[PDB]
């Protein structure tokens, strides 16, 4: 059975599946690129002639007749098959536009994000020809917007808990649908509500019924769909976002999307098929933060000098730069992997969401800090974009959950190979090649040889110094997984403190290797910036190898860290019991 | 000459001047306390019956007739001599009220902060009897507000650059004053503008003139003072904040405050005499964040459970708790040191500002993260208090500057003792006791003895485990200073990258020892929470000893860190040259 092409999955097994990762990918046909040249121009000039971010914020919705203009560029159909009404773009052409719009206004660009990153996305990802023909030409025009109605009060971050749910009619010719969904994008505006809901089914093991989760397409034309007024939120304000209510809505059963009960797989497939766009948009946003910053820090005097001459400004600026270049270099790589058409990349997707969402927030905060008083005002716009970033660590799955998902979904196949232990011990002689070099891991790991991994020939020689770091990290990272997995078995899923820290380890490690790949590309092709990219990549790899070391080491052994986890359980418990901070002030009064 | 009682100054010399720090201080007379008990009640109940934070934000000023009510409690005169119209409070009684108001609305409480933490503060800290009698009874009533008009466009965070400046009249009977000041609190409302400006003086070495900096008191009753409309800012919005302009304002010369040219010392004295209030207010704010947090995390289900049962929630909550308890335990300690009346504590002051301002922001961000979607809305208020915190890392001196100040002002006296080297080598025999145990440092440090430091008897025995950590940290921290100081001499002031990291080291180390002191108090007196405080203190000390290790070690030796600092200088330079992010996207387009 073929090895999972996922680099991260390989990395959990301590294997080195570079092949989704090297050379840093290129995917454009010469027409696909050339087409892109013709699109970049007018769209970006739109976002200086036409748009106005501050006014968009003030109105708490898009400029309606500026929004309209996007319909005419087909902005609501960028990924649709061209003759069915779209631009037919590959993932990576689309991602470039996502970078552009992310440079300018998160609000509009996330209204799109809802509408086309995930909104109708099921119609492409499973819809039949009849489904596409019916709905898609409407949606692509942006005459009809769509929304991904997962979340409801009871619980949103656990899909299995959704109580909003649906009765097949007795003639079977339609499903019937009920429930609230809360915080749905374009809930005021959309026509094509995708809705995810529970439904009974007669089972295929006994003919008893069980309850399973289904995804659906619902036009507001059905009647009985209704939505609240918009909520008030920290930013993104030009985006419409509301509840949606279902008055027993009827749904002709050929509007089952995918197949009844496949819905949960659909939901995770859509969200993973969308996440790359977020990293693209934040890449753009960061590009415009860092520009705004360096310009201010170019002009401001202090202490008789331009402040960019002072070390702490240089460090802040360099970090923000590295974070942008990493995010960009990851986003384009995931889009390219999809356009090539690898099928498995679930971890890389989740990692890209986590890293881009947190890193943009780090950058924007530093930006305000360098910008000082100037920065804090409503005039310079940085303030709005900061407020707008903080949302991204939450929606489209909160990063804490996504961390746990990364770690668990990762160490599925490690668990498989450990099961390979129990199998092989019970066929040592009949089977051949059963464990050849498997204990060799300990031959490598106990006696302190090189593990046998290298980036030789894989990375441009000059980088290989920093490239060496990745091997070190990898050897250390995969090592701890084995131990901490084995000790805890499938009980691991309750070792949350540990799982989180493995999530952060995986994040930094994969972020490392991505940049090291792109750097190798730019070095070899010799673009004039290639030495600059070398300098960035090296700085990142040095820091990331440091953090990974102190994570892995502090996690593997320290009794004091077990004292910490004990303390956190104790202290959290005490806070919960008291329902508050336990201790009075030193005065008692 | 007496040893500086400053613990931090001692710490720079690697000495252990616990005596400003142990036992954890108590300062209240039984009337001072009892008075406080009578004040806590009605004020806090005011901040539930009367105030409304959301409306305050909406109006972008205080509820005018709610503001009025504070005048009647004397809120604008809490520190004024009672018979001159104040409450006569010690620092620590005032600090308790600061904790209360910080629990509820940063806006009002910083309008006070401007008015009385620093505003009139020069009138107490140097004003003559005639000055106090004249101005103070007006100000204490809050009929007249006051402002600390340091900052102006040209430059604000460097006091020496202020161009706003003043001519002594030829009769000498008044000074005459000119310039703008920008971002001045209560600039719309205040009557008693303190203003800080340059002025010529005939020198006392030749009778040639030089230019020096003076502080002044200015009533708007003088005429010729004017101010802009209010600016728009991310929060705190109920605070008024504006420019102020000076139309050649005349100032009768007995309104020199302190003495002409002493102004810069006055400015730093005021700001240091104020900073403790900020740590108090944020302590309160954090107390109400963490309460809001634990309550939401007490009720929310997910995955079939209350989420507080899941490890990552427990860790977040425990950290937020530790950060609150540290901030509180520091603020009250600085206030107590002032009420006792130690004179030198400049570093502890700056540290308290840095740590409280950053730590509250860490807490508020985690609070939003646990609060998820619920958290992001305008309904629960957390979003406003988050926006309101981000300002504190900037104003009253930006933390980056304050870091550099901490490190430099610290290693002044180390430089003195190294000069003691050059002196002693040129009197080895005449002088006695010249260097006895001084090379003993290397006897201790090379051969790896204990340095001779301990907390034995100083800290409660059970803590001494975590107490041991401080000695380790201290030995490591002071060690690097010596080396990095010596190598760089007074050129050190240009080794910014290094100085910053020493600032962070000092921060964590002193924060540790503070909590270890308070914990020892609570243990010995045996308050029912004392085991809880033990658990907090231990967790903090373990983490802080870890971060200090990796700071000191990574800074002292790694060539790769010198490669980093090289890279940052190179990369920052490239960004400045290009005035932007250097590299195109992987597509070139
Ligand atoms: C709501 C609000 C209220 C305010 N109220 C007051 C008030 O009551 N009184 C008052 O005096 N001010 C007030 N201010 C102004 C605020 O305190 C200013 O940030 C500060 O006083 C001066 O900062 P600046 O912007 O002039 O610094 P800048 O000149 O803009 O420089 C600060 C930035 O440059 C960098 N920098 C500058 N010099 C150095 C150096 N030597 N080394 C390294 N980095 C350096 C820092 O990293 C920082 O990012 C207020 C501001 C706001 C937003
Ligand atoms: C502006 C905006 C737009 C939105 N648009 C959409 C949209 O288009 N589509 C959509 O589906 N949703 C949307 N949402 C909702 C958002 O995606 C939700 O945050 C998410 O869908 C579900 O989160 P929740 O609040 O229900 O999670 P909750 O049930 O509130 O739980 C999340 C919190 O609980 C903790 N937690 C939960 N489970 C665990 C666990 N197992 N272990 C440890 N900790 C745990 C986490 O630490 C986190 O802090 C939007 C929200 C906003 C604010």
Numbering used by the authors:
A (entry chain B), B (entry chain A): 68 to 656
Show sentences the authors wrote.
Mammalian complex I (NADH:ubiquinone oxidoreductase) is central to cellular metabolism, with key roles in NAD+ homeostasis, respiration, and oxidative phosphorylation. It couples NADH oxidation in the mitochondrial matrix to ubiquinone reduction in the inner membrane, reoxidizing the NAD+ pool to sustain metabolism, and captures the energy from the redox reaction to transfer protons across the inner membrane and create the proton-motive force that drives ATP synthesis. Complex I is a ‘boot-shaped’ enzyme, with a hydrophilic domain in the mitochondrial matrix that contains the cofactors for redox catalysis, and a membrane-bound domain that transports the protons. Here, we use a popular complex I-linked mitochondrial disease model, the ndufs4−/− mouse, to define the structural, biochemical, and functional consequences of the absence of subunit NDUFS4.
The 12% of particles in ndufs4−/− class 1 were found to have an additional large low-resolution density on the heel of the complex. Particle subtraction of this region followed by local refinement with C2 symmetry produced a 4.2-Å resolution map for the additional density, which was visually identified as a dimer of an ACAD-family protein. Mass spectrometry on purified heart ndufs4−/− complex I (prepared without cross-linking) identified two candidates, ACAD9 and ACADVL, both with mass ~65 kDa. Although our complexome analyses of DDM-solubilized ndufs4−/− heart membranes revealed co-migration of ACAD9 and the ~800 kDa QP subcomplex (but not co-migration of ACADVL), our MALDI-TOF and LC/MS analyses both contained substantially more peptides for ACADVL. Considering the sequence similarity between the two proteins, these data suggest ACADVL is present in greater abundance than ACAD9. We thus chose to model the density as a dimer of ACADVL, and a survey of positions where bulky residues (Tyr, Trp, and Phe) vary between the two subsequently confirmed it as the major species. The resolution achieved was sufficient to model the two FAD cofactors in the ACAD dimer, accounting for the ~0.3 FAD per MDa protein observed in the purified complex (two FAD per dimer bound to 12% of particles). The location of ACAD binding in our map is surprising: ACAD proteins are known to be membrane-associated and located in the mitochondrial matrix, but in our structure the ACAD dimer appears to have ‘slipped’ around, into a position that would be occupied by the lipid tails of a membrane bilayer. Therefore, we conclude the ACAD dimer is artefactually bound, and that its observed binding mode is not physiologically relevant or involved in enzyme assembly.
